[PDB]
């Protein structure tokens, strides 16, 4: 899955696809805590956490 | 020539034409089945033409053969439907306020916690997806690419 | 079902209906509210046009034939018409063949052998020689036929067996190999033959071919048929 | 269909018609009688509000019994997930036994104490701890007065009732779900549900298809899932007319095959190359017949 391309704007965390103008939607606070609960435990470790 | 009277040559009388023509619980359940949408008739057209109507849509409400939509002002039949299902009432009140008590994990999460205590998930996480120099016969060469 | 589907029909959305059962098949319309129906007979299709699988739009068009009736159907799913039209497809060249079709299109003694005059009209009618000798002898000379015949036996008698013998019993159906577009040949001879050993599809002809349809249009019903293969 | 569709609207049915309210089994009926409905045509269907439909569809939403789905046409689509209803009921049907087992279990503990002025509750453990020098009455730590015993000996038996007389209503439900997982389950999309709509208006304003962006990596959350036959009678003359033909194509085939003249003879010595019976059938017929007498709009298009 291609990742998308991170910029803060205000307090929101918002991503832009880039096509096969790219698309672009907000990264809901929800989604991205469903994301962190996901990283296993060598990988946060090695991130420094 | 008014499509709401009909003539009646036996006679020579006319008389008022309902929208659905319906005197009888066993016609009302029968042209309700016949519906091919969820489009509810309205109470308004049918106390027209019967002249009761809603001690029978209530006597049905009872029996669980019909559903009906009542006003909030005060108990007042509206549209209704057909009740494909069964029994209108069923669960008691004391199940209603668990079952709202009760709020459902993240749904990520949901099938591993079902797989966890025994029951197999009819679910996977969405984790899980993987989305996947001659130039004189120009114009009379067929392209034969394949066979 | 493969017989009903939703449509939409100029400008108005309704349910497309494929009636098999009523012969000639049909193709009905009706809306959803029912206020508006249309129904087009599949004879009368020549061709059946379709959209391309690349194309957003989905009007499954039936070209008539003779500004040929042109009746434009749109799907929803492009599963679902290819379900429809791999049915269409079927009706359609089942159709198209019959039209072309139809634009196309014991008694070995001497006592018997003396009486069976129906035997005796026979041979002297495809035989030269023999006509010129019994039109001499038997219609002005006034002889008897049945003594013309008493000397004639061997004639009468081989005449008569060839039209009398019949080919023994075989397995018909392992002949008939289907062989997009596929040929079969089938003779008379081969009919006869299937009815003897399978009086099923004797049941089967025999009630149907005058009463529905014509009997081309059977055998190829008969041989798409699961009781061919059965 | 497939049978086990039956069986799993019919669950979906119960379910809404006895855990959910009135306006919430027109709501989830006329989705499952219908296919993907959108906003507008349900309002219509059902003459119901948007502050009205809110709640409905918002609750609805929560429990995962009906999805949503939201594209450019933005628009709204409603619709049934089938693997997410079913594991939904089934885990809310778990817990909720759960809950009343759990309850029902805590409550054969003893009861406890409690303080009628603070209004503190207080287990039997720590009671024992606060009872006053005389041994005599237990004493609130806070409000140094007597604990009154707490209101939880009789309910051991209502709970026990409750559980009894819920598993009897629910069983329907067990009974599907065991169904339910003996078949196989599979995963309903917007497109695939496409393939059993039913309009639900003549004209509605909602373009009822999927047209997705050509050429796209996104990924949103929760949107994706795991010939003819021709025949030829020969009628009594057809064989021996095919015959002729087959007699015609060998005929052709050996021309095809025949070498060129000159290959023939030796071309040295020529020039070098360079620049009635039918009366008598008709009079046979009057014969015999006397005979038997004597002993008695434009777009692409292609061709399929
Ligand atoms: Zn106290």
Not at chain 1, 9 to 28: A, M, N
């Amino acid at each position: 899955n291609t990742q998308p391309t991170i910029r803060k704007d205000g307090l929101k965390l918002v991503g832009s696809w880039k096509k096969d103008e790219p698309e672009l939607r907000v990264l809901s606070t929800e989604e991205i805590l469903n994301i962190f609960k996901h990283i296993s435990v060598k990988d946060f470790t090695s991130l420094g956490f | 020539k008014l499509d709401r009277i009909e003539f009646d040559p036996k006679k020579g009388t006319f008389k008022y034409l309902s929208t659905y023509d319906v005197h009888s619980p066993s016609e009302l359940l029968k042209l309700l089945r016949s519906q091919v949408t969820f489009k509810g008739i309205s109470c308004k057209d049918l106390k027209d033409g019967w002249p009761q109507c809603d001690e029978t849509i209530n006597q049905l409400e009872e029996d669980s053969k019909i559903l009906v939509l009542r006003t909030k002002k005060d108990k007042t039949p509206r549209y209704v439907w057909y009740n494909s299902g069964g029994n209108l009432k069923c669960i008691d009140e004391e199940f209603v306020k668990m079952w709202e008590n009760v709020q459902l994990p993240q749904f990520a999460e949901l099938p591993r916690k079902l797989q966890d205590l025994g029951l197999k998930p009819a679910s996977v996480d969405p984790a899980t997806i993987k989305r996947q120099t001659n130039t004189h016969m120009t114009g009379i060469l067929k392209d034969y690419s394949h066979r | 079902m493969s017989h009903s589907g939703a449509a939409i029909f100029e400008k108005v959305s309704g349910i497309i209906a494929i009636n098999e059962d009523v012969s000639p098949a049909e193709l009905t319309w009706r809306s959803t509210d029912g206020d508006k129906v249309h129904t087009v007979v599949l004879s009368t299709i020549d061709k059946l046009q379709a959209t391309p699988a690349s194309s957003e739009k989905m009007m499954l068009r039936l070209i008539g034939k003779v500004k040929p009736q042109r009746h434009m159907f749109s799907f929803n799913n492009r599963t679902v018409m290819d379900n429809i039209k791999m049915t269409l497809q079927q009706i359609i060249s089942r159709y198209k063949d019959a039209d072309i079709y139809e634009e196309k299109r014991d008694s070995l003694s001497k006592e018997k052998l003396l009486t069976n005059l129906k035997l005796q009209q026979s041979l002297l009618k495809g035989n030269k020689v023999l006509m010129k000798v019994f039109q001499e002898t038997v219609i002005n000379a006034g002889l008897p036929p049945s003594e013309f015949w008493s000397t004639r036996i061997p004639l009468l008698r081989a005449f008569a067996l060839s039209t009398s013998q019949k080919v023994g019993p075989y397995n018909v159906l392992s002949t008939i190999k289907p062989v997009n577009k596929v040929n079969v040949n089938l003779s008379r001879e081969k009919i006869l033959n299937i009815f003897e050993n399978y009086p099923i599809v004797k049941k089967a002809y025999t009630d149907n071919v005058p009463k529905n349809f014509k009997e081309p249009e059977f055998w190829a019903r008969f041989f798409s048929s699961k009781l061919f293969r059965k | 269909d497939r049978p086990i569709d039956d069986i799993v609207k019919n669950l979906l049915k119960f379910v809404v018609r006895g855990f959910y309210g009135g306006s919430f089994v027109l709501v989830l009926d006329a989705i499952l009688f219908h296919s993907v409905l959108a906003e507008d045509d349900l309002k219509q269907l059902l003459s119901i509000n948007k502050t009205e439909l809110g709640p409905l569809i918002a609750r609805l939403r929560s429990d995962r019994l009906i999805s949503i789905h939201k594209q450019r046409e933005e628009r709204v689509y409603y619709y049934v997930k089938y693997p997410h209803a079913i594991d939904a009921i089934k885990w809310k049907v778990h817990q909720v036994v759960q809950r009343l087992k759990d309850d029902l279990d805590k409550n054969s503990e003893p009861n406890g104490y409690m303080c009628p002025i603070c209004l503190t509750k207080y287990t039997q453990l720590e009671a024992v701890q606060l009872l006053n020098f005389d041994r005599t009455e237990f004493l609130c730590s806070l409000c140094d007065e007597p604990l009154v015993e707490d209101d939880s000996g009789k309910k051991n038996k209502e709970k026990q009732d409750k559980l009894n007389r819920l598993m009897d209503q629910i069983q329907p439900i067990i009974d599907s779900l065991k169904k339910i997982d003996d078949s196989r389950i599979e995963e309903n999309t917007f497109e695939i549900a496409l393939a059993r709509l039913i309009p639900p208006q003549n004209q509605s304003h909602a373009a009822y298809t999927y047209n997705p962006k050509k050429g796209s990596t996104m990924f949103r959350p929760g949107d994706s899932a795991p010939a003819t036959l021709h025949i030829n009678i020969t009628t009594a003359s057809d064989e021996v007319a095919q015959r002729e033909l087959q007699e015609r194509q060998a005929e052709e085939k050996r021309k095809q095959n025949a070498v060129p003249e000159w290959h023939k003879q030796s071309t040295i010595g020529k020039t070098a190359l360079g620049r009635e019976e039918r009366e008598n059938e008709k009079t046979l017929n009057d014969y015999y017949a006397a005979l038997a007498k004597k002993q008695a709009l434009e777009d692409e298009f292609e061709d399929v």
